[PDB]
């Protein structure tokens, strides 16, 4: 009984720690993705991870990198505690049904179940996080929120409670793409290395193939993550639909635009997952005692 509570608590705390550390990368990712959208811009102003971060620090200030952070922490507590903490339980449920799918298929189906539930519960916090990360006093549309709790109050009043779930469907599509692509690519890359005797079947080969899988999952996620960030950030009526947003991005900016923010997106995915997994294991083990 108590180990489930330890699993949930450990996943929540470990996700909060990883989110705090990675969060400047998230703001750089979002600002690179929204940068293409920004109307009437005469030139780009964010390029590179460190160039974006330094531009924001110099003009807007260091706290602006964090600007969405309380909604990030709320996302880690509500969404990531359920997503990561319940994974073992759902994989156990599927292992009791182990005739129904391969081990890879069971890992995928547990990931898709817990990720879908966690994305649905998470979505208000992502709408607030993204809107606060994208907004600037020196770009685009005027800032409309004085931080996280004001963002919730204003979105819920202006757009209704339904409005806080804006962009659920691209976020589901992104999380499905991440989970499927990362699991498939990891197992295929491990097979490729070991079966051809390219690397020893030991922790180095697993870490290398996990890096390759996490990159490929970020790459596949990226078009959907750009359209997600733009659709979530957009005031009402700017995009008639999510496919309208994707069509506009492709039509004016072209196919390179969908990848915008790819490098900070990958760096955050990898660094967040590493810090989260290390802290989750260490805290789960220590608290279990």
């Amino acid at each position: 009984h108590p180990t489930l509570g330890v699993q949930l608590f450990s996943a929540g705390i470990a996700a909060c720690l990883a989110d705090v550390i990675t969060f400047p990368l998230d703001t750089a990712k979002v600002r690179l993705q929204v940068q293409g959208e920004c109307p009437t811009s005469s030139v780009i102003r964010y390029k590179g991870v460190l160039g974006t971060i330094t531009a924001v620090v110099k003009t807007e200030g260091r706290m602006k990198l964090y600007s969405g952070l309380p909604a990030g922490l709320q996302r880690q507590i509500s969404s990531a505690s359920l997503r990561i903490g319940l994974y073992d339980t759902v994989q156990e449920f599927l292992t009791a049904g182990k005739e129904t799918a391969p081990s890879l298929g069971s890992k995928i189906l547990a990931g898709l179940t817990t990720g879908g539930v966690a994305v649905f519960i998470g979505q208000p916090t992502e709408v607030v996080k993204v809107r606060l990360q994208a907004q600037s006093h020196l770009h685009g549309i005027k800032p409309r929120y004085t931080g996280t709790y004001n963002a919730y109050r204003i979105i819920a009043t202006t757009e209704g409670l339904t409005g806080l779930w804006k962009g659920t469907t691209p976020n589901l599509m992104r999380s499905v793409i991440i989970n499927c692509t990362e699991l498939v690519t990891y197992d295929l890359m491990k097979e490729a290395f070991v079966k051809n005797n390219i690397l020893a079947d030991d922790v180095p080969c697993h870490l290398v193939s996990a890096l390759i899988a996490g990159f490929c999952a970020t790459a596949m996620s990226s078009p959907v993550d750009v359209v997600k960030t733009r659709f979530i950030n957009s005031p009402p009526g700017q995009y008639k639909s999510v496919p309208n947003c994707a069509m506009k991005v492709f039509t004016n900016e072209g196919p390179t635009a969908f990848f915008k923010g790819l490098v900070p997106s990958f760096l955050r995915l990898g660094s967040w997952n590493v810090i989260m997994f290390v802290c989750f294991e260490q805290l789960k083990r220590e608290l279990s005692k």
Epitope: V194, N197, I198, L199, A200, D201, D202, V203, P204, C205
Partner: nanobody
Framework: VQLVESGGGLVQAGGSLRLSCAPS????????MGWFRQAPGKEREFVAA???????YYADSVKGRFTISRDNAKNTVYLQMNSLKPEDTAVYYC??????????????????????WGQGTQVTVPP
């Protein structure tokens, strides 16, 4: 960690033998296990290894003739030796290595990569 080899002995050419390695103490199922042999007056040579994931590796001199296997429930490693030849006469040593020490397949053949070693068992194949 203490390693105890067993199953050695004298066998005619073309015969078969099965070696066993039993680790004692703070042994983890995550340890890579390897087998080495040293003929009289010769240097210690690699024979076979099995990763913690169960992937077997074999020296070219024993490829297709020897089969390494692992029983994780008993933490025991076995080396099935078939089609033995006089040149296989040597003392066989069991070795264990902590996880993460092997990057390339060639790393399994490096004696310095193993943290624990057994006392060895003599295998003799008369001409």
């Amino acid at each position: 960690v203490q390693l105890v080899e067993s199953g050695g002995g004298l066998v005619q050419a073309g015969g078969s033998l099965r070696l066993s390695c039993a680790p004692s103490g703070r042994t983890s199922s995550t340890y890579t296990m390897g087998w080495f042999r040293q003929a009289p007056g010769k240097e210690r040579e690699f024979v076979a290894a099995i990763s913690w994931t169960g992937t077997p590796y074999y020296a070219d001199s024993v490829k297709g003739r020897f089969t390494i296997s692992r029983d994780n429930a008993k933490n025991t490693v076995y080396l099935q030796m078939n089609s033995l030849k006089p040149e296989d006469t040597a003392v066989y040593y069991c070795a264990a290595a902590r996880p993460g020490l092997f990057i390339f397949v060639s790393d399994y053949a490096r004696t310095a990569k193993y943290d624990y070693w057994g006392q060895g068992t003599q295998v003799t194949v008369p001409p």
